[PDB]
Design a protein around this ligand. Structure first.
Ligand SMILES: [Cl-]
Lengths: 374, 369
């Protein structure tokens, strides 16, 4: 009988995690409806915070582990494992991301994805049947060549020499050999959060569109673009997979195409991966009311990926859905209310972000109650 | 049909009470097109009370020229009701601090003559009822200019009409209300008065409100002596104790002169406006009350509304503007001052969108069984 209220928000970036957002909403709602049946389900879009969100949702753990970082030195990375141990959650950026690289050291000719392969290997080592991988924020333009080598593939040059680390090495590539390739991979269900359509090569390929932001000069870009062409050609030829035409294969320096061609990964929109994995639809089918939201700081990246995906599912069950949306200044949702917040370089500001979500949530609930009485 | 009353105050430096009410109704109609809406722009007796009352009563604004606070000609205004039975006056239009540049602020010289004129013109339209707000005064003359403009003869020891301003009060020797417009006692005159301060003393007009009107400490002492006298002469010649009036110090002592000379009632501004628009009958009949206000600083209207509403067990939601008790829920809108080109438009849009989401939320709650 108790009213069932599902609270499935994204994070407020640079401030509250998805779960802290859900918790502040629940506290506000409980001021009006102390005895409702609340189900919190912290969501993510496959980007930053996905591993933590997934681990919370699944009662899992974060496993910290030393891997090879993007410049080939030892870095501390992490992956997540589900409560049941059947799923691993990986953000490649922990091993191979731009922020593992101090500004006066970005060379996308040298940077490697090796440590992403190590994270995948450790996940596989833990017995998982399912891996979810986020590939945003990459330092690498090596087409995932480091990654697949770390997993057992031999990527050699014309004289049988393993290729050099980074995109540099891919120019020299003569034979892909997957006799050594970790056999647990094709048995595994591997999903990659991929929200771009860019292919491996060309004028909207990996090097052209994303190489600049990893520090490629105009000329470095042609070299890498020309090398990923060869890569695709040696992929089609030595793996018998066509990767040149794949939508999203140009993601994370071409790692999208390596994850597809070597690992049997599926490239899917991240919100759909996360939505399926946490069984949102099953949680919602029952609900009376769905509350969601998200917070963005930068106005370019204000994309309601989580609220809209939540609303799309809810509408199939005709559930009312209300969003509490965070912004610096102030789509299937029945209503959206805004919360102004800032970047948390006080922690006092973390508390104020918490308080403003809670208080808005209170007023939303009070207004729902007022509606009942009409 | 659902009855929805929209009864907000203005957003200061932004949307008028009516413009708030219009933005709210627009957003609500996006969810509930066919409900019954009533916009009642409200005011607390302060800035914007004449304009809100005209709108709320389908009346009109009358522009007329009067004597400003330093004696010069100013274009003041007032409001008549739709039935032409009530006048709405803001003193400040005639005798306000906005009419006096900061450099030229002298509470020894400033006159309320202009205010008396406004009142005379309202009496001239045969109104039975006058609502006067007395905020933002430049004057510390005890309403002496005002009443002299209404025919009261206030003169020194030689029969000479006293000079303009509270400095004229130092020589006041006799009050004669024989020329005093006979239409005043007849008139139901209500004065928005929301401070308890009396005419004279430590918490009197001059001590408490003088300084902001340019009163120096030395000036404050002169004026307080002169108003103390005025007060004694009022008791002697009009047989009325203004010396003990809560609110007599309002508007440099104008509250006491409206009480004593005019027969006016001093009431809380919100309580005058309530009765005038029959807010209690509108609300008793409503299903749903929406209110609000906007402030630029660090709310009598929303609380006044919610207090009535809750008496009839009506849901009340506020939509509150800003730059950075009895309500079921309140939601905030950020606005900017309206000197920027799109500031008014953006504020109106933000109110509208918020109201839509309030309406949509109320609707979802309806279907929560
Ligand atoms: Cl490194």
């Amino acid at each position: 009988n108790a009213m069932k209220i599902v609270i499935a928000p994204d994070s407020y970036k640079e401030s509250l995690s998805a779960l802290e957002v859900a918790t502040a909403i629940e506290q506000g709602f409980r001021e009006i409806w102390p005895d409702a049946d609340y189900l919190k389900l912290p969501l993510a879009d496959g980007g930053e915070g996905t591993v933590e969100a997934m681990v919370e949702a699944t009662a899992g753990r974060i496993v910290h582990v030393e891997v090879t970082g993007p410049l080939g030195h030892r870095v501390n990375a992490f992956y997540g494992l589900s409560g049941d141990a059947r799923s691993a959650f990986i953000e490649m950026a922990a091993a191979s991301g731009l922020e593992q690289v101090p500004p006066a050291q970005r060379d996308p000719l040298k940077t490697t994805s090796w440590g992403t392969g190590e994270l995948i290997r450790h996940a596989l080592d833990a017995g998982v049947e399912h891996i979810i991988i986020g590939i945003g924020g990459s330092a690498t333009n090596d087409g995932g060549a480091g990654m697949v080598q770390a997993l057992g593939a031999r990527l050699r040059d014309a004289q049988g020499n393993d290729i050099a680390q980074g995109g540099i090495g891919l120019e020299t590539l003569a034979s892909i050999d997957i006799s050594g390739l970790d056999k647990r991979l094709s048995a595994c269900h591997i999903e990659v959060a991929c929200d771009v359509t860019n292919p491996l090569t060309g004028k909207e390929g990996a090097s052209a569109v994303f190489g600049p932001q990893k520090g490629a000069t105009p000329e470095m870009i042609e070299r890498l673009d020309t090398a990923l062409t060869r890569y695709a050609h040696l992929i089609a030829r030595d793996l018998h997979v066509d990767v040149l035409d794949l939508a999203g294969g140009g993601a994370a320096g071409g790692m999208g195409a390596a994850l597809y061609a070597f690992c049997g990964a599926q490239l899917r929109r991240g919100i759909e991966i996360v939505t399926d994995a946490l069984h949102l639809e099953a949680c919602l089918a029952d609900a009376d009311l769905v509350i969601t939201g998200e917070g963005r700081i930068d106005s370019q990246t204000i994309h309601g990926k989580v609220p809209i995906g939540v609303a799309n599912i809810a509408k199939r069950y005709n559930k009312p859905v209300i969003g509490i949306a965070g912004s610096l200044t102030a789509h299937g949702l029945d209503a959206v209310f805004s919360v102004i917040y800032t970047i948390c370089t006080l922690e006092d500001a973390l508390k104020n972000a918490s308080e403003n979500v809670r208080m808005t949530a209170r007023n939303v609930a009070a207004t729902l109650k007022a509606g009942q009485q009409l």
